[PDB]
Amino acid sequence: SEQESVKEFLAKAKEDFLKKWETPSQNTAQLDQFDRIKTLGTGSFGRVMLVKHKESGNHYAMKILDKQKVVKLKQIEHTLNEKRILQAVNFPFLVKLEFSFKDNSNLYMVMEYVAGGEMFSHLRRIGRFSEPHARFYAAQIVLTFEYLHSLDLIYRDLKPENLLIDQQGYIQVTDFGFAKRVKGRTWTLCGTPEYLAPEIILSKGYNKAVDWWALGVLIYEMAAGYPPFFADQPIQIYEKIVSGKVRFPSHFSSDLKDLLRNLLQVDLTKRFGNLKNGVNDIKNHKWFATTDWIAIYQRKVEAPFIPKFKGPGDTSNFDDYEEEEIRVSINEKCGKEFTEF
């Protein structure tokens, strides 16, 4: 009956998610409440400077993003959706939006800061992961989805560059630009060619099931080094995906191979994850026997890699000198559009 504690947690999660979803938090800070140290990333619409909140002392990673440049890039909706999710969502493996606020010149998204970096570049460092070390990262992704999907959300953008390593060596998740709240099904072609599920390719209506295909791709690429479907031109990539014949490397476990063939199933009615048993197909799989799901959830597991910390305090601050500060315009720019933010 202790498995039934999961249902109760989700129910309380959902019942607490919709709460924040229906009436979203807003303007939970002034800019003049922390000083900016160093540009920790060149993000989608503006420099991402490091900050230290004066009240708490704690360090945060804050996204800056010009009002105009969103509309000029036609992504007003994208960014508004992205916030409304992060504002209302909450999980161990999701970057927390600590504060949100607008002014005249731009919106601000103060996020919880992570030492270490995106795991793509990390995967570039160490050629490929061993199965148990890879399992550690994958098992998280499961629980992160099980969560999101439970809320009728689909992340739709699972790819290494997105997910980042913790200070404590776990995973935190990216951005939600593409992530959508969908009860039924959807049609928007949005994603990265190697992780797109065949459904999306064929323009047939895809649903929540996709993220498991994505997981499959991610699980493969990790344990093998290369992705399962990779080509010089995207047209060629699609055809390899849809004609879903997958060739495994030599070292691949009989367990590991089985899961992948099940996650990378081209028939959505046969695809692991999206079945009668739901996620428990994945969670009760032989490749996930060793893993204690609840321990991973409370992070009570020894992470295979810990990025040498040196603290939050930068050894190279801003990586030498930088562009100084920021300026908020006198007149209001595009206020009507971001009334919700």
Ligand X SMILES: Nc1ncnc2c1ncn2[C@@H]1O[C@H](COP(=O)(O)OP(=O)(O)O)[C@@H](O)[C@H]1O
Q: Residues comprising the binding site for ATP?
A: 40-48, 63, 112-118, 159-162
Q: Interface mask (CB under 6 A) for ligand X, residues 83-102, using x and -? A: ------------x-------
User: Minimum distance from CB of 215 to ligand X (Å)?
Assistant: 19
Report DSSP letters for 68-118, one per residue.
HHHHHTT-HHHHHHHHHHHHH---TTS--EEEEEE-SSEEEEEEE--SS-B
Under rule CB under 6 A, residue 48 binds ligand X: yes
Contact with Mg ion (CB under 5 A) among 118, 146, 175, 199? 175
Whole-angstrom CA distances from 113 to 16, 164, 167, 174, 193 are 24, 11, 9, 12, 29
User: Minimum distance from CB of 101 to Mg ion (Å)?
Assistant: 21
Positions at the binding site: 40-48, 63, 112-118, 159-162
E strands along 163-275, which residues? Answer: 163-165, 171-173, 180-181
User: Minimum distance from CB of 171 to ligand X (Å)?
Assistant: 12
Contact 47, 26 (CB under 8 A): no
| Token code pair at residue 328 | 């908020």
157 catalytically annotated: yes
Closest residue to ligand X using C-beta atoms: 175
Query: 3-class SS at 211?
Result: helix
DSSP letter, residue 286: G
User: Minimum distance from CB of 165 to ligand X (Å)?
Assistant: 10
Question: Choosing among ligand X, Mg ion, none, which partner's interface includes residue 114 (Cβ < 5 to 8 Å by kind)?
Answer: ligand X
Q: Which residue in the list 157, 166, 211, 281 is annotated as catalytic?
A: 157
Residue number, 191 or 198, with CB nearest to Mg ion: 191
What residue ranges bind ligand X (CB under 6 A)? 40-41, 43-44, 48, 61, 95, 111, 113-114, 118, 174-175, 177
Which residues does the annotation mark as catalytic? 157
What residue ranges bind Mg ion (CB under 5 A)? 175
